From TrEMBL, chain A:
2-oxoglutarate 2 binds at T173, R278, R290, R294. Residues 224-295 form the TauD/TfdA-like domain. Fe(3+) 1 binds at H147, E149, H276. Keywords: Iron, Metal-binding, Oxidoreductase. Belongs to the clavaminate synthase family. It comes from Streptomyces lavendulae subsp. lavendulae. One of its GO terms (molecular function) is iron ion binding. This is Hydroxylase. 2-oxoglutarate 1 binds at T173, R290, R294. It is an enzyme of class 1 (oxidoreductase). Pfam families: TauD. Fe cation binds at H147, E149, H276.
Length: 317, 336
């Protein structure tokens, strides 16, 4: 159903060794030299892994893929943290952050948001006690709402990379693609027109902030999507757009799949071909909870220049 | 302008790599070659990779050149009389592969379905029958400076020009934007949507003739530009170090917009007067940032005897997926 790649022990050992070597060689990501070297360093990954990801990227066909069987040394990585703030970067799991950064260079360029997790290029995803009953990344008890990442945003991620340091209770990530066959030729044409408002999140000078846009784009035979139901509205008078939006929602909602990122899995989500979400789970808060790392990938770093403080920064805002 | 000069050791390494890859791969008709390009480019000398990566990330200079490649003249052979009908791959396939590797370090090579048989690597040499045209296979006529496809939302992000030969040292003109010669008020105007940049009709089926529903959709966005004549900016990105898109021939400054006229003239003078002659000599590879520089080519006299100036050209996009609406399939790298 969805292509994936399973590392041999030899590949897993090569990758682990590489990330350890790299971690000892470079300070943190605060080293501009590491960010420079990223694509060259990523060419030291096993060739089969490079070829698989390049095929996924170019095939432009599936909403996600997974590289399975990485060796994520649990003792070295240590206990899942209580919070991301006040925590020292780099931590003992730096090799794994570096792994995801190497992967982000094979896909495009890593970038981040200056006001998010202190502007770290690699984000943490783990249950936080205080942020518990909020439906955000560091939450536990809720979600239920799949999304394109930053659907409102002109420079939103092209891909997301999620590396599962641990997932002992097999908590799924929801991911859903667009099945076009349940959708009429007329509704598709409407969804391609700029007839919808996608509002910004409460996360995030110039803003900017204004127009109305499409939900579907790219090829009409195999469309890309920007879908965030919670933040999306249709002017009341546009009954055709509302009709087509209703049909789109029903098709995407009913096709959502549960994708479990297990320990040693790296999940790649294509932000144009899939929406994703997370499901509620009871956290333990003992230091053994689900811990993912996350890196956002842009195909074209220069396109977001106007929202970046300098030419060199990869942080928007 | 920073440039990189290869040592004889680096040139030899680059040459040997391109000959090895030419031997291992069929042609560019192999989709496996296209998949492998960025990994193959990691086999280039490290100093070259570091240099281009710095150029790309610095986002500061509008061109750069890597000088001193070994382009074996006896192997490459005579400059062709036409691009049409040639046996592929040609004996110059290693130099074509070289540009392709460079293109993978900058982004993705792409082309245009109606240009040079859809080849990803273009030829630039004089064709007798084109002697009187203002185009790449011309000679006698000046090719006036331009951003490549200024009108086009999926225009090249970079251009790569490799000189297989240039015996008379014909310059490629290249010009950047000295921001310090423009008033803050002029800059503000250039950033505003006040200018019309007309689509070059050679990109479009000029025909308002419905050859399939599929084809019409591939050109609808450009057709909308022609139909609606949106006004757009000439400068964009950062106000302090802006990108620009400038093709004077296709640009219309609206008659009544006095301020836009004043701003444009000042911009045109700054760019025109800053133009430089960049000679891409044998074994040079010239890299043009299509957001930070305009380019063109000076008149010259062709001999049509197999000894003429011969460049190869690869256009680069930072985001192949952005142009999906204009490509026949997900897999194809050709717009139109
Ligand atoms: O925790 C997950 O599996 C996904 C969270 C998410 O939506 C995101 O990180 O964008
Ligand atoms: O021949 C040259 O040096 C440049 C011609 C040109 O304008 C181009 O290839 O885009
Ligand atoms: Fe998300
Ligand atoms: Fe966001
Ligand atoms: Fe040109
Ligand atoms: Fe053109």
């Amino acid at each position: 159903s969805t292509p994936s790649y399973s590392l041999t022990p030899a590949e897993a050992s090569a990758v682990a060794e590489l990330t350890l070597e790299l971690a000892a060689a470079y300070g943190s990501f605060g080293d501009p030299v590491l960010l420079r070297d990223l694509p060259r360093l990523a060419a030291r990954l096993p060739e089969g892994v490079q070829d698989f990801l390049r095929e996924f990227k170019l095939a432009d066909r599936h909403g996600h893929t997974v590289i399975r069987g990485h060796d994520f040394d649990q003792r070295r990585i240590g206990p899942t943290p209580d919070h991301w703030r006040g925590r020292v970067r780099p931590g003992p799991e730096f090799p794994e952050e570096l792994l995801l950064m190497l992967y982000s260079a094979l896909l495009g360029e890593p970038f981040g948001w200056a006001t998010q997790q202190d502007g770290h290029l690699v984000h943490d995803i783990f249950p936080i006690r205080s942020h518990e009953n909020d439906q955000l990344g560091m939450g536990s008890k809720q979600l239920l709402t799949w999304h394109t990442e930053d659907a409102f945003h002109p420079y939103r991620s092209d891909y997301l990379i999620l590396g599962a340091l641990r997932n002992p209770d097999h908590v799924p990530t929801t991911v859903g693609e667009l099945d076009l066959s349940s959708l009429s030729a007329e509704d598709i044409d409407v969804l391609f027109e700029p007839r919808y408002h996608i509002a910004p999140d409460e996360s995030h000078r110039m803003i900017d902030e204004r127009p109305l846009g499409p939900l579907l784009y790219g090829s009409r035979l195999d469309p890309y999507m920007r879908l965030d139901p919670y933040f999306t509205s249709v002017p009341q008078d546009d009954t055709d757009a509302r009709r087509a939006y209703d049909a789109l929602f029903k098709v995407v909602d009913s096709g959502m799949r549960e994708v479990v990122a297990d320990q040693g899995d790296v999940l790649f989500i294509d932000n144009h071909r899939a929406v994703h979400g997370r499901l509620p789970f009871q956290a333990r808060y003992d230091g053994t909870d689900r811990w993912l790392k996350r890196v956002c990938v842009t195909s074209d770093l220069r396109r977001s220049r106007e929202m970046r403080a300098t030419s060199a920064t990869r942080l928007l805002g």
